[PDB]
């Protein structure tokens, strides 16, 4: 199952303020008007390969999704990234153990850290060996698809974990929709406004006018 990304999946590329400038930079970004894989909250939560990095988003009203797992193999042999919001806190850990084996969450792990209408958006990538997370929340009103428009995701964390991620999966509260696409290296044009908000962008490779 699929739909179209349009111009979703921009994030602040560097820890810097700029304003009133059409600045441009090269990084892993979601390519414009590319397809995305489509899912909804029935039975719908398989393991996925991670590639060079994941754009992930979900449209919810009640937090059906509570977390994610990432790693080589999720196997109780190697320390593997676990992410949860445990209703009181954001929680992050690198467990080997299948203490819960399935994506089901009930209604020695070295590194650890703690802190439809709701569209949650994320970008996950690994560079420096560090796991880098970018985020957004917004109200939405379109039912089937990622809403055609623009919003730049904000950084969260830059975690020293060093994991060979090749696979990942999401985690569900058990006794809404979600979407996936993959980053690629692109040069982007980025529109920093007067208040230093990224307000619009161009995927230069998209078509000959975008190159122009």
């Amino acid at each position: 199952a699929y739909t179209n990304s349009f111009t979703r999946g921009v994030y602040y590329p560097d820890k810097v303020f700029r304003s009133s400038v059409l600045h441009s930079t090269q990084d892993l970004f979601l390519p414009f008007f590319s397809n995305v894989t489509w899912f909804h909250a029935i039975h719908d939560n398989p393991v996925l390969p991670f590639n060079d990095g994941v754009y992930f988003a979900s449209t919810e009203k009640s937090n059906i999704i509570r977390g994610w797992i990432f790693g080589t193999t999720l196997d109780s042999k190697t320390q593997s990234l676990l992410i949860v919001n445990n209703a009181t806190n954001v929680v992050i850990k690198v467990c080997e153990f299948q203490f819960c084996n399935d994506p089901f969450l009930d209604v020695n792990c070295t590194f650890e850290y703690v802190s439809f209408k709701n569209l949650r958006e994320f970008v996950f990538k690994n560079i420096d060996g560090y796991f880098k997370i970018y985020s957004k929340h917004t109200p939405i009103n379109l039912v089937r698809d990622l809403p055609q428009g623009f919003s730049a995701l904000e950084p969260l964390v830059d975690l020293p974990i060093g994991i060979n991620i090749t696979r990942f999966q999401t985690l569900l509260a058990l006794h809404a929709a979600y979407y996936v696409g993959y980053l690629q290296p692109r040069t982007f044009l980025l529109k920093y406004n007067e208040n230093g908000t990224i307000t619009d962008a161009v995927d230069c490779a998209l078509d000959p006018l975008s190159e122009t």
């Binding site: 602040y12 820890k15 810097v16 303020f17 700029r18 304003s19 009133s20 400038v21 600045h23 420096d128 904000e154 950084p155 020293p160 208040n195 230093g196």
Partner: protein, 424 residues
């Protein structure tokens, strides 16, 4: 006089110098952490790991007195790349990593950027622009045990050619056999962990050497590993020298409404140069300018008329150059203009035609009591044609003018024998 290589100067306006406001104070601001970095855990641990299994440690959020390591004369090498070794006590970093192991002393060569050989190709590698320090010392007092410390091991071979900072632990036999080796030795089929017999009686290169590689997460981003450094009281709205976390500069530090999101640490200009910082100990967004500067145009009649002189400081206000030359800054009178601050020249309202040009309609001349005067130039005299719908004027006489005009037509023909010029 010296600007023109001459003992005599003609009437004009001359460039002579580029003035700059000097820094009034030297600010330092720093990450606020005080806990000393864990160098005892790095350098004085019971064993460093086997060289195929080289250990790694993160250093973060601590104060790094590298003088401690620099004074450790036991270091058979203390080589650094991208930093001169003593500068580590003031330069600072986001994180630093220590890699560590014991090696055969002969093979210490391979612990440098661009190296080749069994370790460099198969079990430890530095990147081509390795930034940081390599430390090694003879450890034959500890890591030799009459050969019986055979725990220290490396690849002879394997076709898995190694990346910089690649960890590996694999014990699989080299599979490249005359037959697929599949757990059984033979031609190319060998176990992947050749060893050092660390005897105290080893030759000085066969002996064990302990190793530390400090590799630096050296970036403009938030520093957390930093040398011991004072943080001063702040100065605002005045020209100062400054340092923030290792970021040097000179400028006016000033208050701002640059609305940094919580992750944004620096403001950048349109040409992407730093123009604001969040103070590391106060978290105010300081907006920043260079300290004030400008050309020093000297205005003079010819020396053959007078030695008396005036100065134009271009672009700057008089209120930002109240310095002290001594006399030619107090000047008895000083006139602000659209071109800059003008000192010593006497302002006058009478609009003569222009003599020495300042700019933006201002000119200067030497005049009566003699002084350099400055005034708004005339455009020429005013006139009013008596136009009326039936009125004509006709000349009743004439005069024949002779008017000179002068044109260049040629310039000196020359040639240069460029081998005789260059090579003599």
């Amino acid at each position: 006089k010296c600007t023109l290589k001459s003992f005599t100067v003609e009437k004009g306006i001359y460039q002579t110098s580029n003035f700059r406001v000097q820094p009034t104070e030297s600010i330092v601001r720093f990450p606020n952490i005080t806990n000393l970095c864990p160098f005892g855990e790095v350098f004085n641990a019971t064993r460093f790991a086997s060289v195929y299994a080289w250990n790694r440690k993160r250093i973060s959020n601590c104060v790094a007195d590298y003088s401690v390591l620099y004074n450790s004369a036991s270091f058979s090498t203390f080589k650094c790349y991208g930093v001169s070794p003593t500068k580590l006590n003031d330069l600072c970093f986001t994180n630093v990593y220590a890699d560590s192991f014991v090696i055969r002393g002969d093979e210490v060569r391979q612990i440098a950027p661009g190296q080749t050989g069994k370790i460099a190709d198969y079990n430890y590698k530095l990147p081509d622009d390795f930034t940081g320090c390599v430390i090694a010392w003879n450890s034959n007092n500890l890591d030799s045990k009459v050969g019986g410390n055979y725990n220290y091991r490396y690849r002879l071979f394997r076709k898995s050619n190694l990346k910089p900072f690649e960890r590996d632990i694999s014990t699989e036999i080299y599979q490249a056999g005359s037959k697929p080796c599949n757990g059984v030795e033979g031609f190319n089929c060998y176990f992947p962990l050749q060893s050092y017999g660390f005897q105290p009686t080893n030759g000085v290169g066969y002996q064990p050497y302990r190793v530390v590689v400090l590799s630096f997460e050296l970036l403009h981003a938030p520093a957390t590993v930093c040398g011991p450094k004072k943080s001063t009281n702040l100065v605002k709205n005045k020209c100062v020298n400054f340092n923030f976390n290792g970021l040097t500069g000179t400028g006016v530090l000033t208050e701002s409404n640059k609305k940094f999101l919580p992750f944004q640490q620096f403001g950048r200009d349109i040409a992407d140069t730093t123009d604001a910082v969040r103070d590391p100990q106060t978290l105010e967004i300081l907006d920043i300018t260079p300290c004030s500067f400008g050309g020093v145009s000297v205005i003079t009649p010819g020396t053959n008329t007078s030695n008396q002189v005036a100065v134009l400081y271009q672009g700057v206000n008089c209120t930002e150059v109240p310095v002290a030359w001594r006399v030619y800054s107090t000047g008895s009178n000083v006139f602000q203009t659209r071109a800059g601050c003008l000192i010593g020249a006497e302002h006058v309202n009478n609009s003569y035609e222009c003599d020495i040009p300042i700019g933006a309609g201002i000119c200067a001349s030497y005049q009566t009591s003699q002084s350099i005067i400055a005034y708004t130039m005339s455009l020429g005299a005013e006139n009013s044609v008596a136009y009326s719908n039936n009125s004509i004027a006709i000349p009743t006489n004439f005069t024949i003018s002779v008017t000179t005009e002068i044109l260049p037509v040629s310039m000196t023909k020359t040639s240069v024998d460029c081998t005789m010029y260059i090579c003599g």
